JSON list of C-alpha atoms and ligand atoms in Angstrom, two decimals:
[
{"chain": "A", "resi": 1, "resn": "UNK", "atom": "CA", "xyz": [27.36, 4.91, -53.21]},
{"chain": "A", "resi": 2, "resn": "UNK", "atom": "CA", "xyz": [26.33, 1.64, -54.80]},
{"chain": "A", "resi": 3, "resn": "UNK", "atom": "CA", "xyz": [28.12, -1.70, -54.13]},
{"chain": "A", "resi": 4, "resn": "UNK", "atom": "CA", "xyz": [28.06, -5.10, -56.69]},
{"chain": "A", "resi": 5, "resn": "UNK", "atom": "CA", "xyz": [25.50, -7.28, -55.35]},
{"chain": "A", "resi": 6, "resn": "UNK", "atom": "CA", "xyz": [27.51, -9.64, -53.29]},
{"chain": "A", "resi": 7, "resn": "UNK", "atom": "CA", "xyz": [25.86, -12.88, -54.55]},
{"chain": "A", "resi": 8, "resn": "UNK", "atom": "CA", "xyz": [27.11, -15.18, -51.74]},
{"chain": "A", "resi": 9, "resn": "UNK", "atom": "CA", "xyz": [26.63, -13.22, -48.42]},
{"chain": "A", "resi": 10, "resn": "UNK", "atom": "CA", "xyz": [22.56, -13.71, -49.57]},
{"chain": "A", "resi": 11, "resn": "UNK", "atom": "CA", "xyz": [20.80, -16.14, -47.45]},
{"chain": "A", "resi": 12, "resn": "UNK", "atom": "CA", "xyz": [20.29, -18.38, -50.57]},
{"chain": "A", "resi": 13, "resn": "UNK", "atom": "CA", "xyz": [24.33, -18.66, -51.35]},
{"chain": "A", "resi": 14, "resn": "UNK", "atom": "CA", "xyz": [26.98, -19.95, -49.83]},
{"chain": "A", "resi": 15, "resn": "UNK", "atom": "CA", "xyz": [25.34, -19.11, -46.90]},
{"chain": "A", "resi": 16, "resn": "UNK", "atom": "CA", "xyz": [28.44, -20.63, -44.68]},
{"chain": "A", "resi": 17, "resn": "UNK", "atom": "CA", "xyz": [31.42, -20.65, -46.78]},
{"chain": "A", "resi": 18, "resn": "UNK", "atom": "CA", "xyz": [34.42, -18.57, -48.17]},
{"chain": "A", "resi": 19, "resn": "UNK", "atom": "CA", "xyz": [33.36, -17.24, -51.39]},
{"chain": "A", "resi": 20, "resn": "UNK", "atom": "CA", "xyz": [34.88, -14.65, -54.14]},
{"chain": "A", "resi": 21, "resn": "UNK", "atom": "CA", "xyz": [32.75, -11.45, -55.10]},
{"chain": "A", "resi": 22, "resn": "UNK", "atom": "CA", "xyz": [33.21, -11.79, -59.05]},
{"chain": "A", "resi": 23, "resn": "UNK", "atom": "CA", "xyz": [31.87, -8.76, -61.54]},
{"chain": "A", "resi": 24, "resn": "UNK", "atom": "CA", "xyz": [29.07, -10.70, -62.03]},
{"chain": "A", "resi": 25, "resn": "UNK", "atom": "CA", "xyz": [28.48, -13.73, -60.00]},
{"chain": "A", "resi": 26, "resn": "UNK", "atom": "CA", "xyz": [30.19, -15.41, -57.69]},
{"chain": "A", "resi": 27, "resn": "UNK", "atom": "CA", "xyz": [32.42, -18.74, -56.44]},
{"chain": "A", "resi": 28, "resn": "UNK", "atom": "CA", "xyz": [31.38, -20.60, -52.80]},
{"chain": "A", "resi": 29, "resn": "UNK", "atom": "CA", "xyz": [34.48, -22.58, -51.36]},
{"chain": "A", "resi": 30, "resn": "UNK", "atom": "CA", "xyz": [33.29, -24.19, -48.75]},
{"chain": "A", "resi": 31, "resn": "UNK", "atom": "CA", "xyz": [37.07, -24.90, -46.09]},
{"chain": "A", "resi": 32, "resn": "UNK", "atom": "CA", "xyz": [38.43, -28.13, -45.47]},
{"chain": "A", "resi": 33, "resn": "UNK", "atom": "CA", "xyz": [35.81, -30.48, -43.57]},
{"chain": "A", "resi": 34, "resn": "UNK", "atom": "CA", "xyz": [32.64, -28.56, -44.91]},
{"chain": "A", "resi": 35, "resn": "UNK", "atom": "CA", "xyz": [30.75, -28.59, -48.32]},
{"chain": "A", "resi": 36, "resn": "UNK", "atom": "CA", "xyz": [28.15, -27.56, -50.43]},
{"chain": "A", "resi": 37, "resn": "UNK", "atom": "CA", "xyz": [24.35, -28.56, -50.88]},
{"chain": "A", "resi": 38, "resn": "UNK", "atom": "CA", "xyz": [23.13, -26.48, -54.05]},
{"chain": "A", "resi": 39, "resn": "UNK", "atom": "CA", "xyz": [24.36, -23.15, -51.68]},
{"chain": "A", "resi": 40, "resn": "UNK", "atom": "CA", "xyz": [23.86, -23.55, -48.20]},
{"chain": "A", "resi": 41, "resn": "UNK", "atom": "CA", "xyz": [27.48, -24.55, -46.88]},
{"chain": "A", "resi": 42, "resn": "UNK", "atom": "CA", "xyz": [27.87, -26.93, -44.06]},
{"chain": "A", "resi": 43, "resn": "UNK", "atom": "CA", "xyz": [29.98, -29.61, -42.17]},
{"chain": "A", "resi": 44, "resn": "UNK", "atom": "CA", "xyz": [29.82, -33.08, -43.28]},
{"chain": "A", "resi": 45, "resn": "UNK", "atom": "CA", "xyz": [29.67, -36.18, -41.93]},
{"chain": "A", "resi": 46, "resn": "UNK", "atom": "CA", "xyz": [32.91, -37.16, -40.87]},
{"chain": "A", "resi": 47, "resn": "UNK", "atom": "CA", "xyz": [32.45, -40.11, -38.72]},
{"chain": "A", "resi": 48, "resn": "UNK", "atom": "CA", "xyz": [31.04, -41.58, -41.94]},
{"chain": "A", "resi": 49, "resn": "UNK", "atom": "CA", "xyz": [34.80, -42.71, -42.29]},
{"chain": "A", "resi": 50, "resn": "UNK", "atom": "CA", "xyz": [35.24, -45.54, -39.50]},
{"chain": "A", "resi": 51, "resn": "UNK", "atom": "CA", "xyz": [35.89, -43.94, -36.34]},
{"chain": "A", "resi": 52, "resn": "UNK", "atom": "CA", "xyz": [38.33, -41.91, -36.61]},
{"chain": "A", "resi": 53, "resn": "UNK", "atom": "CA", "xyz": [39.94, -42.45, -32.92]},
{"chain": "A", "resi": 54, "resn": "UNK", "atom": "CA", "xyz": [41.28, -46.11, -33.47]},
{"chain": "A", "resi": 55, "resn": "UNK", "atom": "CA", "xyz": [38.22, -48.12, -32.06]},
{"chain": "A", "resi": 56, "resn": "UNK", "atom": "CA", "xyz": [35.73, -45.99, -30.53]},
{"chain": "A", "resi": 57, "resn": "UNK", "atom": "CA", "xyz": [32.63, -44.96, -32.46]},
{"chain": "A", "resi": 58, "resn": "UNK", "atom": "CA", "xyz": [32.94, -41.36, -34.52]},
{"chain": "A", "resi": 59, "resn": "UNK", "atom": "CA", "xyz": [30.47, -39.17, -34.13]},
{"chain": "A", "resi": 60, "resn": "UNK", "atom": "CA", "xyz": [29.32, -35.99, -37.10]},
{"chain": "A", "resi": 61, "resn": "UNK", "atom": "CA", "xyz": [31.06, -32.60, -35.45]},
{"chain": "A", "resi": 62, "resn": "UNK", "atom": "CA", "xyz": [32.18, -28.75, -37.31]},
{"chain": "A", "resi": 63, "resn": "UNK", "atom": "CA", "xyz": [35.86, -28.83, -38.93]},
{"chain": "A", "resi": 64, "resn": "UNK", "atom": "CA", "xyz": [35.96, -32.49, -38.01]},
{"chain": "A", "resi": 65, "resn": "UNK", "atom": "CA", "xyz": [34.20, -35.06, -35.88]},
{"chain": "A", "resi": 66, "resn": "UNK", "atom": "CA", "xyz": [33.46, -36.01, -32.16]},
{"chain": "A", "resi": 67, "resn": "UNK", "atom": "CA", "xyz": [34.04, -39.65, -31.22]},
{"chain": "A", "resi": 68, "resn": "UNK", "atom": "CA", "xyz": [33.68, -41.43, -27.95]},
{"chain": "A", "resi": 69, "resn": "UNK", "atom": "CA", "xyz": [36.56, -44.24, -27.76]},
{"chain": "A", "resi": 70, "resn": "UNK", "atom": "CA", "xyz": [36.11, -46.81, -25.32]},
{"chain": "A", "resi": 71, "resn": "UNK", "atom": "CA", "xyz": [34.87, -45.12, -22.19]},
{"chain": "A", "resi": 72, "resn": "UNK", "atom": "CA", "xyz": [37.90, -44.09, -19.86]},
{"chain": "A", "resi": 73, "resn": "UNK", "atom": "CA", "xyz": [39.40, -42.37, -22.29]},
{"chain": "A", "resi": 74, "resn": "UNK", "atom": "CA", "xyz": [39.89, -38.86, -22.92]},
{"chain": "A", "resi": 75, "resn": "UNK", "atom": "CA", "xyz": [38.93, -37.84, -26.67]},
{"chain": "A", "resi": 76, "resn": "UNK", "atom": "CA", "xyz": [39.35, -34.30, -28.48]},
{"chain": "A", "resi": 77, "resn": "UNK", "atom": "CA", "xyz": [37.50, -31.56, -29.89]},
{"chain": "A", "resi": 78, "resn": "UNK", "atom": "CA", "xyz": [37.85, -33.27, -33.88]},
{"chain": "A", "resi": 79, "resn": "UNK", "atom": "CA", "xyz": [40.89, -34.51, -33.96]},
{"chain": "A", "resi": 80, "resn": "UNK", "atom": "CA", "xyz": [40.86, -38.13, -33.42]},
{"chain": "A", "resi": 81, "resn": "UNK", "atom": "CA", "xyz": [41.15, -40.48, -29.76]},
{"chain": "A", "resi": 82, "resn": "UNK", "atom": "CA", "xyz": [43.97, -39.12, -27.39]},
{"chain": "B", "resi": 1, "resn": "CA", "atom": "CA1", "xyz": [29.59, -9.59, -57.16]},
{"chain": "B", "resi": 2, "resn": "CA", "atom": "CA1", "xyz": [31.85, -33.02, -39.73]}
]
């Protein structure tokens, strides 16, 4: 059998993202919290907001951030402090 080339699944598109197989080409979409450098789909830097917890410092995570509020705390994975 012979399948369309699938454009984004190549190392050199997309590469982390959720993309749509067109007849001839192709669409990267990186999620919510990610984006896209030319192809190669990533997370970006989220604690380039203003710490994110409430005073803490944020911190660059995946899907969100990390962040380390003032010690004695207990933070999350990348939500914000809690
Ligand atoms: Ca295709
Ligand atoms: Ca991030």
């Amino acid at each position: 059998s012979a399948v369309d080339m699938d454009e984004c699944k190549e190392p050199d598109v997309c590469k982390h993202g959720q993309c749509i197989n067109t007849d001839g080409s192709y669409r990267c979409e990186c999620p919510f919290g990610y984006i896209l450098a030319g192809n190669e789909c990533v997370d970006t830097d989220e604690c380039s907001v203003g710490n994110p917890c409430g005073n803490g410092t944020c911190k660059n995570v995946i899907g969100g951030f990390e962040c380390t509020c003032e010690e004695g705390f207990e933070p999350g994975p990348m939500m914000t402090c809690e």
